[PDB]
């Protein structure tokens, strides 16, 4: 079609997924869209499992998915992760986090759900 919005795009979706996984690592609970939250949880679990090795290769892997926040920063993200987040789930082989289905969105009635984690 003629010039119009690109909107949701593969690069846009992967950047947004990176934003959400970084956010959920920073805080621990994120209210988002469940449809993309499925793959968000998938990638979060994969990276957490990858973060458990705790070596320089792991630091390089984390280098590809960090973005700063209002107060918590990328260096703080990596430090806190390799300090207590990744070692926390060493006793859990998969099934790290859980999504709880919240109500539909006020603006568009999209299925908003909250992703959280515990161990």
């Amino acid at each position: 079609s003629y010039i119009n919005k690109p909107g949701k795009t593969s690069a846009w979706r992967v950047m947004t997924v990176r934003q959400q996984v970084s956010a959920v690592l920073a805080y621990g609970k994120i209210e988002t869209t469940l449809k993309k939250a499925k793959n968000t949880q998938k990638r979060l679990d994969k990276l957490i499992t990858l973060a458990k090795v705790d070596n320089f290769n792991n630091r390089r892997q984390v280098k590809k998915w960090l973005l700063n926040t209002n107060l918590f920063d990328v260096d703080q993200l990596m430090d806190h992760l390799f300090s207590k987040v990744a070692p926390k789930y060493e006793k859990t082989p998969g099934g790290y986090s859980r999504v709880l289905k919240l109500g539909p969105r006020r603006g568009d009635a999209t299925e908003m759900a909250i992703l959280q984690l515990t161990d």
Binding site: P104, R105, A109
Partner: protein
């Protein structure tokens, strides 16, 4: 009973609101608020507020109970409209209508006012025939 509470012509499309309005008919008051409190409808927060106001009106203004109130009748009366222009191709400037609705709901407690209206109509027609044949007496 009636236990009505008008909204009196707010900006709202009757076609869209009338759907859930006819959904809520027949149902009780308590069994409908719980299901209404979850749907993501722009025509749901207003109905919830209307239900709260009507429950208050019945309990206090009319001294009703509320444990037996049911939705007697819900209607979305025809409201006025406003005409606006739209920037279209070739400067057509077509007209778009904006619809309102005189919203009101009815709540009943007694098992009556179904054939009671029929009896009232019968009383009216009996008054008509008594007035007619009364003038027919000793003609």
């Amino acid at each position: 009973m009636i236990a009505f509470a008008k909204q009196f012509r707010v900006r709202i499309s009757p076609q869209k609101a009338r759907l859930v309005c006819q959904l809520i008919v027949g149902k009780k008051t308590a069994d409908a608020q719980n299901i209404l409190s979850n749907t993501p409808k722009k025509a749901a927060t207003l109905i919830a507020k209307l239900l709260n106001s009507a429950i208050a009106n019945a309990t206090n203004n009319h001294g009703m109970n509320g444990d037996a109130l049911y939705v007697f009748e819900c209607v979305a009366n025809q409201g006025p409209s406003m005409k606006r222009t739209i920037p279209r191709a070739k400067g057509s400037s077509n007209m778009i209508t904006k619809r309102s609705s005189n919203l009101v709901v009815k709540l009943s407690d007694n098992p009556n006012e179904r054939q009671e209206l029929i009896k009232q109509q019968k009383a009216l027609v009996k008054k008509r025939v008594e007035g007619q044949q009364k003038a027919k007496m000793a003609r």
